[PDB]
Design a protein around this ligand. Structure first.
Ligand SMILES: Nc1nc2c(ncn2[C@@H]2O[C@H](COP(=O)(O)OP(=O)(O)OP(=O)(O)O)[C@@H](O)[C@H]2O)c(=O)[nH]1
Ligand SMILES: Nc1nc2c(ncn2[C@@H]2O[C@H](COP(=O)(O)OP(=O)(O)OP(=O)(O)O)[C@@H](O)[C@H]2O)c(=O)[nH]1
Ligand SMILES: Nc1nc2c(ncn2[C@@H]2O[C@H](COP(=O)(O)OP(=O)(O)O)[C@@H](O)[C@H]2O)c(=O)[nH]1
Ligand SMILES: Nc1nc2c(ncn2[C@@H]2O[C@H](COP(=O)(O)OP(=O)(O)O)[C@@H](O)[C@H]2O)c(=O)[nH]1
Ligand SMILES: [Mg+2]
Ligand SMILES: [Mg+2]
Lengths: 437, 431, 84, 64, 8, 436, 431
């Protein structure tokens, strides 16, 4: 019945989805060829796999996602390795050549050949549904396909489906770190589009992942594998209440009405706890109060912006494991009596709790320890207005002398759109300030 | 299934292309005869970017060899690991350019243009993408300069939407080298300004001192120098061929390294580089590689970057590592040497990561940078140009072959105003 | 010591046939190597994407359904196939 | 001259050399121990002043 | 090491 | 249930608290790997709850932070024999040593290292349900032990406030010295940990040296014996939280009863008997004479002569088979003795706490298994002589500005020397005006 | 981790550093190949203070050997424990700086200063914490008085936060040593007192005295002298690399000594040194290591302490000290000969106990004295310096390579006001 689809766009989106689907297969017991060691009969009257996997006649669980990218490779490793029989052949859509870090080339010329095919494929996917729950667009704000073709696909979904939930998982750029020069261009040029068509957009930052997985997991040389495994654990903690039952249940519908006070203000920060390693996991008891404090401390916030300067607006705690309701309630009481976590004055009640009974499935090959309790903290903190203003300042610095604009104006989009994008992000920043005060 | 043709021009272009077509032949696992004999399907996946397949195991390289010296063409076709060339794409003249841009451009040039462009299109429908062209030649040469820049002009007007990697080698600015070195240099760079998407420039003097100071091995010779040339070849376009982590192809490098369409001349660098008797004494790690890239000895375009700033730079790390270290070191370079960069471009140092390391190295790094250090080379080329032009020395050759002083003066005006944009964007502040 | 397993002779013979524009050489060889797990092909994760889902058949024990997964009792004890 | 010099692979300790923040921010500056039962008794003390009479005398037992 | 010994 | 948080700052403090944790592990039967193999006869006890916390299986993790800027003493702890016991991120190391410099410990390196130890103290306190004090081990010699200890005090007094903080400092000797900037660093650390400490508990190297020379009949041991003796002292201090019978005192007791005025919070220490196993055969250890051993002038933990100074409070903590009749008789004899003088506003200057649990002995130690022991905590005015000699050394130092260029170069200004000078001067006038 | 980098200047510095690296590689159990042929794990826990890890189990010393004579590098390469050094760290000339400060500070020696700081900066940025820079040379020599002091000035300019500690061989009070030694020494120590943190002066005359009269050794040679010097290197640096009881590293010693910005010259001493004949007929205890410690016979460099006092004393003990006896004999000396001590500094003795002794010794104890008897060295150097400065004997050399009598006379002013402010604290009462 309940079922959510995923759209993995670009290099970052496809690698994140690779980690995600590895985690889903090892959690639901589906072998990498797509076949369980059992079926609907002979034990296991189970339906938890139906959210992410579609079952055919002959015991094969094809996924319910689309790995789409404008470039070769990226999805070709999926097509030629490990999870290749499990994925459908015209489900891993590749283009001809990439946008190559260009909102223009992702949205306008190279975009309008793959968009019809991917729309037909997701239309077939929604045809094979008994009532959809929502979308999970795994992409990156960095550049090219993630800022471009992903936003074009999202506005196609907005004009097509309408009221369905259109959640984002976006790799926000860093204060001190970028990978492309034109990310201050592409991020603003894509947040001009995501703002009026999204429902909530989870922010993930790369060096924040670096810090949370080097201080706690204590790995001296982290990489994209650990990054994507941690993000896969976060998204499993989010969409675990559909697949598993128990206590307090939240789905993709209480998620929208509990993080979004105003239709522009839909950019939450994620937080996972515990991110402790196997060696350090012995000498510290995993309590609900201490994992709550580990969620609220700023060294575990998943975007580098300090929540001390700013106000928490709406917060959701997705507990997962052997969680009893009281120690959640008492932890919430302790942080509510504490004054340093300054909730905004117009939101007296601030938390929303979802408790799931299934313990978090450890990935054999990661660095996370097998913990009996976990918690995902999703906060609509106003501290990301600092990140928005910093991005606007970087855009001002680059656009002051028309640097890296000739590619955008010569691909096919107008040069004037940068002004509307800048004024839209200025409106977003002043809306954040007006709501925060 | 993206495509790069590598169509070489001139004696220097032919030599660097032969080194290219052997250093990637043993990289992808192909014998001199042509049959694949490698030990990995990672080689076998994207051979199609460079090699047109035939019956049996033949993988003949898609390359329009353009030249005017029969001896040079014979040496290229008879060199080891280089007899894989198909007999179809062997267009070459017999008169020769004779170290003259205008002779290689107009008399021996334009008649060869029809046959050369026929071979280019014959290899151009025999593909799927044609992601880019790769023309390799020399500034100051005879055959590679005039015929080469005419080929950029023609291919640009007939396919006007694709990357043209002009991989050119400049000679040493001192001594004399060719007697019409500044003439050919000015004309060739004048065509490369408004007809080329992106251009790499290598200096022979810097090749000499990087092969003599860090590599040692007594005399630098030429083989090791052209081996670093072929290393930069195989390192720039390695995300297009071998898979891995975060990727960046020719178009991505062009959009991340060209702020303004005129200012697209780059300074390459290959920086695993150790001598014979100092390789056991050196631990190899990403901070060490980063130090070797940003060390000014490894710059092969001469042009000490400390006499200027850096507009943009890209580093292609080729070998599996941790990108935590890459991010750390690329940030630390900016954060400490922020004065020798540009403050109006935030985070002007770029990274790409491929997994497959090259032959015999744990990891490699290709360092290519758009900087203001090459304005010194351009202004000294212009100074030698006007010094040998005010007396009209060797003007008669160019006027006989079909050029004129108006062409000379507009070429040097273009060189001067490119120097002006480098100086202006070096001195330009943030706001 | 070797990075790649010694592959069978038949696929090498299939690779050593005609060109790939019609497709009897590299194309058919890549199809026949695709139709095989990339775990009995190599010994080392030479690609970063390849360590995603490594040797699970030897690092994981017998797979099981989740302990607190949701059921389909309102479609099993409910609506029947054939009736009156 | 002064060549370009990058950083290094710092071995890792409680000081920050590798973190991309340059400073450690603490969630709790002046608030440490909580004393939940003591705080609850303070809420009892605060709430018990809002009565409208004396203490609620419950009832009496069996008057034999 | 094998490539190094091949080099020298 | 009721518990203390231990903070071990500096090399001396790390060694002292290492001996402390050895003694607590041997007292509670906790193995060095953290496991508790007590299953032969107990079947139900949590006397470790003051110092240890249960964390699954059978493992106990101690409430301790081991903070020192040089990464060698904590490193040899990490590679030693107590590797599995301690939590790995409790053992906090820096990169560069403060090097006998208050400005290094408090102004330059301290401002980036104090945040992680403050969050560790936060985690240890939040993992606690009945927390009632801090036990901080740091020498007054200087460097990490002075500047960072002062920083930790001035931040802990803001973070926690009314909670009790007790230092167990190594006070420098009148004649024995190691560092030459101790007259600077002691004054600098006292001027800051005057208004925030609740008790001070100094000990002295040459005093313990001479006590081990005479009583413990050993001529060449090392600092391990000093550390073990101070571990015995802290065991006698905190025995009345893990074991309570007869009269019992918690941390609030001998901090509100040792301190008359809120600047004279500088108690001494004494442990008796410190007698060795060979000598203690031919002895009758009784409460009638162990108090005489405590009040013997050449038996204190700091060799300031107690004959030329009255006593304010004389808090005794007895341990072992003690029946209060002879506490009463011994206090009567001591009060009737002429030489042991008391201040005229203290006829009630004795607070006694008796514990029935005998003092445990550590393997490899030199103290004997005595069925009776007592830790005496004085608040005498004899420490004013130590303050006077320390201020004399600081006056001879600062009189014409020796070793000041380091401090005034790396952060800490000129006026703090004069502020500490006038604060210790006012301290000496406080001792004199209160003693008269 | 705390890490210091070694640099050797001249023949003197090169040979002293060679013996230093031999002694500490023997202590850390590293064979001349480079591997770890040791026994205990205490050797490989602080190996990084002196060594960089390489491929495999290879360790390379962090030494930046530099001079202008090829013969010193030839000798250290031909000798044992020379193969561990990195040939990239062999920047060297072919002339020699004429035993001249100006020739080592402004002439072609100053041209190689760019390369040697390039190597120094490479090592210091591959460093982790950069505890400091240690240099070995002679004050009256060639490159050591020249390029050595120029290295001092340049390094203290570019990193003015770390310790810059020098050892230096000072001239003998007798014989003649070098003819231009007063000039070289005056200019050198004028540079040393300006910028350095501390100096451990060595003098060949009293090394000969202690090698002939105390340590038997009818033929002292010079390797035994360098063995004693390397022993007092290892004794002072053992606190950074070996654990034990309470320890004082180089920063500890620099702050516990050096009361003023000036006056940082120390005269060291090694004190297990007893005759090979009486190593039977001498016990081993701290009450006699203390009298050998404070004996006027030991006194490694130059001066009789009886013509003065001891302003501060540091003693680094190595071995299993039951150090109550250590501190009681320090107090015992301090209150028995209080007349030979500064009264306005009480308790002026530092003790640093490490439990790891040097190989072949149960106990060792190294001296570091900021003695007030060091007046004689500066006084005799200033007297001789002005003696031929008023006579114009060989003063034309320094003016030829770039000096002048003006800078000569503020060098003499630095000497005489250093001696004056030294007297100001020598003849200062307690009250
Ligand atoms: N967390 C995470 N981020 C990634 C990963 N791979 C790439 N990224 C992010 O992606 C950004 C680079 O832009 P891409 O997302 O690769 O752009 P693209 O989707 O490939 O589109 P084109 O640039 O046109 O090729 C970098 O800043 C990274 O932060 C990954 O595996 N994990
Ligand atoms: N009882 C005892 N005292 C010690 C020990 N180690 C050092 N001390 C004393 O500490 C005094 C000097 O202070 P240190 O502890 O050495 O300095 P620190 O606190 O470690 O600060 P840093 O030197 O900067 O690391 C000396 O005078 C010693 O008397 C020890 O192991 N046991
Ligand atoms: N890197 C490189 N440079 C070359 C080569 N051949 C010539 N040159 C440079 O080009 C100049 C001579 O050009 P030339 O080869 O005679 O041009 P041509 O007449 O077209 O063959 C010299 O100054 C050389 O520095 C070569 O094979 N490799
Ligand atoms: N280590 C060492 N020191 C020497 C040697 N010869 C002389 N010295 C010392 O160095 C001082 C003179 O230095 P000098 O040799 O002129 O320095 P150089 O010119 O740089 O080689 C004398 O006081 C000697 O004590 C030697 O062979 N080895
Ligand atoms: Mg891409
Ligand atoms: Mg210390």
């Amino acid at each position: 019945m309940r079922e959510c689809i995923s759209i993995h766009v670009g290099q970052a989106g496809v690698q994140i989805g690779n980690a995600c689907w590895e985690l889903y297969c090892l959690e639901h017991g589906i072998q990498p060829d797509g076949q369980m060691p059992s079926d609907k009969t002979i034990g296991g009257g189970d339906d938890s796999f139906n959210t992410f996997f579609s079952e055919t006649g002959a015991g094969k669980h094809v996924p319910r996602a689309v790995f789409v990218d404008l470039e070769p490779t990226v999805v070709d490793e999926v097509r030629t390795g490990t999870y290749r029989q499990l994925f459908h052949p015209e489900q891993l859509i590749t283009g001809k050549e990439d946008a190559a870090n260009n909102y223009a080339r992702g949205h306008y010329t190279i975009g309008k050949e793959i968009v019809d095919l991917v729309l037909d494929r997701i239309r077939k996917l929604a045809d094979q549904c008994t009532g959809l729950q929502g979308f999970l667009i795994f992409h990156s704000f960095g550049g090219g396909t993630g800022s471009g073709f992903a936003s074009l696909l999202m506005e196609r979904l907005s004009v097509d489906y309408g009221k369905k939930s259109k959640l984002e998982f976006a790799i926000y750029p860093a204060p001190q770190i970028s990978t492309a020069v034109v990310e201050p261009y592409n991020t603003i040029l894509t947040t001009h589009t995501t703002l009026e068509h999204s429902d909530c957009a989870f922010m993930v930052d790369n060096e924040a992942i670096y810090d949370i997985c080097r201080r706690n997991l204590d790995i001296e040389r982290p990489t994209y594998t650990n990054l994507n495994r941690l993000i896969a654990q976060i998204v499993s903690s989010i969409t675990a209440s559909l697949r598993f039952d128990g206590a307090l249940n939240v789905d993709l519908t209480e998620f929208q009405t509990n993080l979004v006070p105003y239709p522009r203000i839909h950019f939450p920060l994620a937080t996972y706890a515990p991110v402790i390693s196997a060696e350090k996991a012995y000498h510290e008891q995993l309590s609900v109060a201490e994992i709550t404090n580990a969620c609220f401390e700023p060294a575990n916030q998943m975007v580098k912006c300090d929540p001390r300067h700013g106000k928490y607006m709406a917060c959701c705690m997705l507990y997962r494991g052997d969680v009893v309701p009281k120690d959640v309630n008492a932890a919430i009481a302790t942080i509510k009596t504490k004054r340093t976590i300054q909730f905004v004055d117009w939101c007296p009640t601030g938390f929303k709790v979802g408790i799931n009974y299934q313990p978090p499935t450890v990935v054999p090959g990661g660095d996370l320890a097998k913990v009996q309790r976990a918690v995902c903290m999703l906060s609509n903190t106003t501290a990301i207005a600092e990140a928005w203003a910093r991005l606007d300042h970087k855009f001002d610095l680059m656009y002051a002398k028309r640097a890296f604009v000739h590619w955008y104006v010569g691909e096919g989009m107008e040069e004037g759109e940068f002004s509307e994008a800048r004024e839209d992000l200025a409106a977003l920043e002043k809306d954040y300030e007006e709501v925060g005060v | 299934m993206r495509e790069i043709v590598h169509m070489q021009a001139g004696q220097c272009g032919n030599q660097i292309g032969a080194k290219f077509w052997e250093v990637i032949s043993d990289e992808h696992g192909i014998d001199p005869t042509g049959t694949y004999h490698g030990d990995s399907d990672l080689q076998l996946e994207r051979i199609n970017v460079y090699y047109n397949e035939a019956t049996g195991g033949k993988y003949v390289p898609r390359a329009v060899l353009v030249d005017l010296e029969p001896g040079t063409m014979d040496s290229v076709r008879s060199g080891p690991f280089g007899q894989i060339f198909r007999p179809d794409n062997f267009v070459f003249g017999q008169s020769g350019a004779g170290n003259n841009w205008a002779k290689g451009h107009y008399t021996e040039g334009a008649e060869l243009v029809d046959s050369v462009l026929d071979v280019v299109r014959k290899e151009a429908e025999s593909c799927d993408c044609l992601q880019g062209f790769q023309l390799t030649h020399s500034l100051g040469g005879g055959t590679g300069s005039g015929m080469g820049t005419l080929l950029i002009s023609k291919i640009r007007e007939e396919y006007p939407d694709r990357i043209m990697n002009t991989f050119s080698v400049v000679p040493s600015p001192k001594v004399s080298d060719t007697v019409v070195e500044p003439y050919n240099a000015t004309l060739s760079v004048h065509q490369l300004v408004e007809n080329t998407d992106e251009t790499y420039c290598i200096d022979n003097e810097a090749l000499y001192d990087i092969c003599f100071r860090t590599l040692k091995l007594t005399t630098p010779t030429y083989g090791d120098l052209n081996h670093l040339v072929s290393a930069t070849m195989s390192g720039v376009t390695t995300c297009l061929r071998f898979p891995g982590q975060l990727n960046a192809d020719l178009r991505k490098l062009a959009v991340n390294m060209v702020p303004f369409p005129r200012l697209h001349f780059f300074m390459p660098g290959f920086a695993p580089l150790t001598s014979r008797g100092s390789q056991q004494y050196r631990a190899l790690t990403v901070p060490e590689l980063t130090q070797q890239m940003f060390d000014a000895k490894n710059m092969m375009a001469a042009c000490d970057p400390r006499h200027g700033r850096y507009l943009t730079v890209a580093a292609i790390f080729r070998g599996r590592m941790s990108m935590k270290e890459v991010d750390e070191q690329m940030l630390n370079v900016q954060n400490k040497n922020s004065s020798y960069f540009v403050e109006w471009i935030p985070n002007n140092v770029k990274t790409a990561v491929c997994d497959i390391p090259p032959r015999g190295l744990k990891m490699s790094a290709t360092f290519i940078g758009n900087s203001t250090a090459i304005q010194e080379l351009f202004k000294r080329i212009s100074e030698q140009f006007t010094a040998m032009f005010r007396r009209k020395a060797f003007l008669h050759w160019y006027t006989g072959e079909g050029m004129d002083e108006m062409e000379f003066t507009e070429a040097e005006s273009n060189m001067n105003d490119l120097v002006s944009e480098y100086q202006q964007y070096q001195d330009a502040t943030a706001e | 010591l070797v990075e790649m397993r010694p592959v069978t002779s038949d696929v090498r013979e299939q690779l050593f046939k005609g060109f790939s524009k019609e497709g009897t050489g590299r194309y058919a060889y890549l199809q026949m190597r695709k139709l095989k797990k990339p775990e009995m092909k190599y010994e080392v994760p030479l690609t970063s994407s390849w360590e995603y889902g490594w040797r699970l058949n030897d690092v994981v024990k017998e797979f099981r359904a989740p302990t607190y997964g949701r059921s389909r009792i309102v479609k099993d004890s409910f609506f029947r196939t054939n009736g009156i | 001259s002064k060549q370009m010099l990058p950083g290094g692979s710092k071995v890792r300790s409680a000081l920050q050399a590798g973190y991309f923040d340059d400073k450690y921010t603490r969630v709790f500056e002046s608030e440490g121990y909580s004393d939940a039962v003591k705080r609850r008794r303070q809420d009892r003390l605060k709430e018990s002043k809002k009565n409208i009479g004396k203490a609620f005398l419950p009832s009496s037992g069996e008057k034999l | 090491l094998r490539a190094q010994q091949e080099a020298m």
